[PDB]
Amino acid sequence: KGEAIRIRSILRSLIPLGDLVGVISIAFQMPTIAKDGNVVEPDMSAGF
Amino acid sequence: ATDMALALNRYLCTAVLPLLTRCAPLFAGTEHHASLIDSLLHTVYRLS
Amino acid sequence: HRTLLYGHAILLRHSYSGMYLCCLSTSRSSTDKLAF
Numbered sequence: 819k820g821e822a823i824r825i826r827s828i829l830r831s832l833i834p835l836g837d838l839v840g841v842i843s844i845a846f847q848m849p850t851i852a853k854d855g856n857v858v859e860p861d862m863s864a865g866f
Numbered sequence: 867a868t869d870m871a872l873a874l875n876r877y878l879c880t881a882v883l884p885l886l887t888r889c890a891p892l893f894a895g896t897e898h899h900a901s902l903i904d905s906l907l908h909t910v911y912r913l914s
Numbered sequence: 915h916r917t918l919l920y921g922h923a924i925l926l927r928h929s930y931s932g933m934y935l936c937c938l939s940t941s942r943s944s945t946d947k948l949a950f
Binding site: 846847848857859860862 | 868869870873874
């Protein structure tokens with residue numbers, strides 16, 4: 819169907835593949851434990 | 867027990883693994899890419 | 915030999931060249947992300 823192909827072409831023009839690849843390549847920050855047994859928790863309500 | 871770990875497990879098991887399962891036939895020839903595929907298998911097994 | 919009516923599709927032919935106006939789908943990539 820030509821309309822579906824047109825929509826997919828429009829979406830591909832809007833969003834390049836490289837941008838998606840880069841955003842997928844971006845990683846998070848792992849929570850870690852201190853001396854004390856208390857794991858420090860990066861705020862999930864914030865951050866990536 | 868960290869919430870981010872649960873979110874990451876959710877993300878992986880909802881998006882990454884289904885995609886790699888649907889793209890399974892494309893995994894036919896990977897001879898000169900052995901190091902990455904061995905790593906993938908071992909990481910999947912550890913996650914399991 | 916028919917009169918134009920709004921909402922129709924037109925075929926523009928260049929008088930000198932004899933070719934037809936079209937969208938190239940290949941862009942200069944000049945300042946517009948989606949331009950053709």
